[PDB]
Design a protein around this ligand. Structure first.
Ligand code: NA
Ligand code: NA
Lengths: 834, 834
């Protein structure tokens, strides 16, 4: 009859049940939440929340003074809206500017009564009942219809009907529906006592002979609704399907507040018809079930006539009001949330306060039974009815049915809006993860869920590992402008890239593409006589094997660093990690120029293959020494005498390069002054006069290439400054670059001045990052496996506010969404002064 | 896009406009209803109702003590519901047990605030906002959905959207929609002052440079809605057609309470699309238009962008808030009711408080104009938009368009629930009838409307006449178990039935059927030698003509009374007037027996034709004298001596009958005692020994007939008691009936004892009714025309609570429904003690 509506999420704050797991534990244990009026606060009994005065104002950007003048019901529905959306796995910011509708039942204003028993401008919006719905719309930036409905004690279930209808019209594409009722003012206690409806025993004796009125309850709840069609298509978890809902009024009843059997019968008949569902197919009804002498028998008689008649098994029935009291305005949504929990647990739970049937309720003639124990529930799909009736005669009935090998290294992402909240979130995720429930879930699905189904708030941590116990232990511990700098020779290492290649197919595919082009060039003109092998085997071979020794010949070293840096750049791209600026030390400037678009892969491969091969053919005798001394000292010392400055790496760190003997003369000068000096492990004197013989040959190679203007800004370590388009686009630039000093420190200075806050080194360790602090610094790949060093670095960019695409880390896993705990609110007291 | 929705009715209680005619007079005059806070009661200004404390509790069956504890807003919406249904021409009792839905916008509880600043059980329902809707449902016994919506200052127009959607789903078949806002508590004045939104001048300067906030207004209104399809089919007056409506929320606005241009634009675009209506086709927009500096320009900018852009003529706009203030919760329904009045008057009316455009509102660039004078409005059908916006961001827009020779003697039926209310109702109907408006209406249409489109309350009058001036003068004067007794010989009169026959085709058709059968019998065996004429010509001929003299020959007299009585019985049947008991004097017992089903028309015609003919053939010499004396005296006097008792008409009224000389001997006996005696004008001594010669002949006629058991109870004036089935079903009964005394007084006694409260005489005057009081008595046809005497008698049965079908009086008139005044409430003060 009507398009079905999926529930894809829910939330609740009920007496002794501060979420849906807790609610199940109260109901499954057959426990009462009814108690005596707490300290802080038939009417000396009720179902109470623990606190009604506390709220995380800070989380919603609400000032303590706005928060103090704000109805606690508005505060509670902001929290439940956030929790319901998290429970559905929706990141709330993606609903900004969308058609999300908010439909809330609320029939009581106790906070406003307290305030009216020093008038400021927060009171107007703090005390107006319409803002219970509209403040949600504002906070989420939702454009759907946003309204409060008042039918008294059917309000929250009428709100669900209106939400369902808005979805079936296409007016809303998603809706929050339910209600709230907080019993804060003594005035509302009296007026209900003086009407006479309260049980002097403080129990709803639902369908039972003691039936003598109701006991009050407070709290709230919401469901998240979509069309079943839209929810399937979007892959949401379906908790339940609303097949139909109906609203009517009693009309001409004996008094204003006497219920009508005829109206209730007419309601049930109509709604079960549109739902297309017979009485035998219905497995359970959540009653209005308040335990009043007039009301209990009329509700029983109507259900018997419509749903008991068609049957051969008694219809089980029950009321959560026997557990939590009568939530009045929010009574219906409590009832629906119990039916949805029953549907997904595929269990029924006790109705309390029952032992002897009401004499006026002939259960056998009606073919009904009060559910008195927990029990499995099976096909008579499962179907449940929920009734909610208002004292002015507006009745609602809902018919709801049951719903119709990944990375080796696993990141668990966690965040919150304060340090204390992040410690809590970690604690809570630890505890859940360790739980029966948590242990059901794959650690890959948990990861995926943390990455894709949660907000990345301001305070972030990433924990990583191979299994649950490691991830959990790292959570328990927690509880208690990007500048890419590409590495140069000296940063190569045996096995470089092998672990990344094993872990990450994006790396492995980019790497085999680069190595494929380079293999052809090294094959044509090898820098080892005979060699027509694989560059990948040279790079990945174990330390001290023959292949591995080839890695230190500059003819292989320069291509190896190029392939490693490009593959890593591309892996980072697939995770949304990309630079604002690039720069490289010596051969790393070719990778920089490549990823900035100056050179095609083919031309960059040709350039680095020749750069290496033409340098390897130079004769023995070349040396380089790092000296602790300023450029000005080393150049003053050399001017007073084959040798020159290969690099200016810091205000007191220079490399001198040339004929071994002349280099050793300058070394013992600085050493003699008591400065640190280090002989570099190099086959040749890079960036020195000894390069002079290969410049004309190299110059002929670079004149065969194409240079385009960079698409990313590039800093030149030749000029020590930002490169003009025209700088990097002349063959001559790249000949000068071989020969003259690498102005690495001035480069780092120039990038700072252009607003780089974080420097990340792209290459196989941390040489260029020691250098940079020495002038945020993270080394992309530093004792630990490459995937661990990489995730730790990307973890640090994320914790500093970089938008890492954690979802793409999980690409190619059959991801199952998993139900994680909701946000760890950090609640303070916010209350009127008198 | 959406099924269109007809408005078939409306009502309003607004500042200085206590209904829709008054509202038009305020708006058309370009007058302000804004004033200073009255005596009894920027915040020393507002639009106020005259009284908020008065209500007709009595009319709704509400006790003064329930009424005192009841929110005036609930009281006001009961009155507006009754007035809206009367305005639509619906008799509310016909909506009992139907699908009527009630959707009310209400965002304020001032009465409850007064009460909370001696706790009784009327307070619970008196102070709960949900009963604003539900109490209507209860009072009308309606089963449709019944709810209050709270979106703050858009509530009443959202209520209309929800009502439209319930009608398009088929959930409601008719709906009441609108809202209410009463400004009763000082507390709500302060909280709005302290938010800062109030104009310190007390005016909404809508779209004007002084724009400095709003002034408060109070009141309420309702529309009556149906699908346009259902309303056409039912022949309702259509006031307006709702083509589409839409609701959205501002979403992420600068603050909670800042309106959104983008959201307003999106709303308009969407709603005009579904309405299938271009910007050039729209003729006017009723703005939210509150006269706030932030709000005025955003509303102007959004309307310009969506509706001003498409145009080449400026869009006129205005706000009733410039007349009556800001009704907050009920602001929208006021706005819609202004647009509907514009649509049906086909006029636009001034927006007040305008002279200089707001500098932030570029009217020319936007292509809008503030309506500043009354003026005709023509095709650019007419189409108007209505906007209503809530401070929490929920916006509503409605697109509404313009709608797509009888009885000679006229009854005006009028009723009310008290004598004072009936005097008022008559006064008000007089005044309206005399008005330009009233004078538009046919006096036949007014009659028809009073009969078919109003409740027949407990205190009834009928005024009748030939034209407006006579009917009106009779209203101004007003302002300051049925037992049918059929007449016998002596009640005939020249022209009997001629006026009824001229006035009432049901009489004329029943009469020509009876006369047709009798003409054949009198033709076969005439009681005047030669006669083969028409019985109708004998009865209708002028006094003292030859035909008229035939009417007094018992051979014609007995058939004439039979035809007149049967035709009149059938005319009364067609007006729903029918007996519980029948009885007749002598020949009237044959009509009684006929309409009770004992005899077919053919058999009753044969019986009365022969009864008359066989008696007319008896010789001259017979006499009858009515004597003032008991049966016991006359029988004691006759026993001590040709003559007998023809009738016992009362405890001291007997007729003696027989040989003229013996009758005259008994006459002068009673006269001699000083008793009244009257010689009857009779050809024969009826019910005497002189009948003895025709008994065997008559006995042969009655033995040819068929007698069935009566379907109505019949009293026999032979036995003076209820007849057994078997009594009237023997030929012998009807021979005895000719011969023995008519026990008329004992008959009247027997009918009293069976619970007859009203005796109506069926025949051409009042003989049997003098007799009956002498033992309620109305003569159906007594100086005045037969139709006037008949309507006066039927008027009296109606005033005593008989359900006369006045609608059928008007059968065969092209009836146009006419808009009559609504119920004259008689209001008393009902208020809290402190
Ligand atoms: Na009721
Ligand atoms: Na807003």
């Amino acid at each position: 009859s009507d398009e079905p509506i999926a529930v894809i999420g829910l939330s609740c704050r009920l007496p002794k049940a501060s979420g849906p797991q807790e609610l199940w534990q109260l109901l499954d244990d057959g426990a009462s939440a009814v108690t005596r009026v707490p300290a802080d606060r038939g009417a000396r009994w009720g179902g109470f929340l623990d606190r009604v005065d506390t709220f995380d104002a800070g989380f919603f950007g609400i000032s303590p003074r706005e928060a103090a003048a704000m109805d606690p019901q508005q505060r509670l529905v902001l929290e439940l809206s956030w929790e319901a959306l998290e429970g559905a796995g929706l990141v709330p910011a993606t609903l900004r500017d969308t058609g999300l509708g908010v439909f809330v039942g609320a029939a009581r204003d106790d906070y406003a009564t307290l305030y009216r028993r020093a008038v400021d401008h927060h009171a107007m919006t703090g005390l107006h009942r319409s803002l219970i719905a509209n403040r949600i719309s504002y906070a989420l930036g939702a454009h759907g219809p946003s309204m409060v409905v008042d039918t008294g004690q059917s309000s929250s279930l009428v709100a669900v009907h209106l939400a369902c209808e808005s979805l079936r019209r296409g007016e809303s594409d998603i809706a929050l529906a339910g209600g709230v009722n907080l019993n804060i003012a003594a005035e509302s206690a009296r007026e209900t006592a003086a009407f006479g409806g309260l049980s002097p025993d403080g129990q709803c004796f639902t369908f039972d002979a003691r039936a003598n009125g109701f006991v009050r309850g407070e709290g709230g709840g919401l469901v998240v609704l979509k069309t079943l069609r839209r929810a399937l298509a979007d892959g949401d978890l379906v908790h339940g399907v609303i097949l139909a809902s109906a609203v009517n009024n009693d009309g001409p009843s004996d008094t204003l507040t006497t219920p009508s059997r005829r109206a209730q019968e007419s309601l049930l008949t109509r709604v079960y018809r549109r739902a297309g569902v017979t009485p035998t197919e219905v497995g359970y009804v959540e009653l209005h079930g308040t335990g009043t002498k007039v009301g209990d028998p009329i509700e029983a008689a109507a259900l018997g006539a419509v749903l008991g008649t068609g049957r051969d098994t008694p219809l089980p029935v029950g009321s959560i009001k026997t557990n939590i009291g009568h939530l009045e305005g929010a009574a219906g949504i409590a009832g629906l949330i119990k039916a949805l929990l029953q549907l997904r647990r595929r269990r029924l739970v006790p109705s309390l306060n029952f032992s002897t049937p009401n004499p006026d309720i002939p259960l056998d003639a009606l073919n009904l039974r009060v559910q008195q124990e927990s029990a499995p529930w099976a096909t008579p799909t499962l179907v449940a009815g929920v009734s909610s009736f208002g004292m002015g005669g507006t009745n609602c009935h809902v018919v709801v049915s049951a719903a119709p090998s990944g990375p080796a290294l696993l990141p668990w992402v966690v965040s919150a809006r304060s340090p204390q909240a992040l410690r809590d979130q970690a604690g809570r995720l630890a505890a859940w993860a360790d739980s029966p429930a948590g242990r059901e879930a794959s650690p890959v699905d948990i990861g995926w869920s943390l990455a894709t189904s949660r907000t990345h708030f301001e305070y972030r941590a990433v924990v990583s590992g191979s299994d649950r116990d490691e991830l959990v232990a790292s959570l328990r511990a927690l509880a208690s402008r990007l500048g890419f700098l590409f590495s140069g020779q000296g940063s190569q290492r045996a096995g470089m890239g092998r672990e990344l290649y094993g872990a990450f197919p994006v790396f492995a595919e980019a790497f085999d593409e680069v190595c494929g082009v380079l293999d052809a060039l090294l094959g044509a003109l090898p820098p080892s006589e005979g060699w027509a092998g694989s560059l990948r085997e040279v790079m990945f071979a174990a330390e001290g094997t023959p292949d591995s020794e080839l890695l230190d010949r500059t003819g292989f070293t320069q291509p190896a660093l190029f392939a490693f840096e490009v593959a890593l750049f591309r892996l980072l791209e697939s995770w949304g990690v990309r630079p604002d600026f690039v720069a490289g030390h010596s051969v790393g400037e070719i990778a920089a120029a490549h990823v900035a678009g100056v050179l095609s892969l083919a031309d960059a491969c040709r350039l680095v293959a020749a750069r290496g091969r033409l340098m390897q053919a130079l004769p023995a005798g070349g040396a380089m020494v790092a000296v602790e001394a300023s450029e000005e000292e080393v150049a003053a010392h050399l001017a007073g005498e084959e040798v020159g400055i290969a690099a200016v790496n810091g205000p007191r760190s220079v490399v001198v390069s040339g004929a071994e003997d002349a280099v050793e003369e300058v070394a013992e000068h600085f050493a003699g002054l008591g400065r640190r000096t280090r002989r570099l492990r190099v086959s040749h004197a890079f960036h020195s006069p000894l390069m002079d013989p290969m410049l004309e040959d190299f110059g002929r190679v670079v004149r065969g290439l194409t240079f385009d203007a960079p698409r990313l800004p590039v800093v030149s370590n030749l000029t020590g400054a930002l490169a003009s388009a025209d700088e990097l686009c002349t063959p001559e630039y790249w000949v000068r670059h071989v020969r003259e000093a690498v102005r690495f420190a001035d480069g780092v200075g120039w990038l700072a001045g252009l607003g780089v806050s974080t420097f990340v080194e792209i290459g196989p360790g941390g040489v260029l990052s020691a250098l940079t602090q020495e002038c945020g610094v993270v080394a992309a790949v530093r004792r630990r496996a490459e995937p661990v060093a990489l995730l730790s670095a990307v973890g640090e960019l994320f914790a500093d506010g970089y938008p890492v695409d954690w979802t793409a880390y999980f690409a190619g896993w059959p991801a199952a969404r998993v139900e994680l705990p909701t946000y760890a609110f950090q609640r303070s007291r916010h209350w009127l002064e008198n």
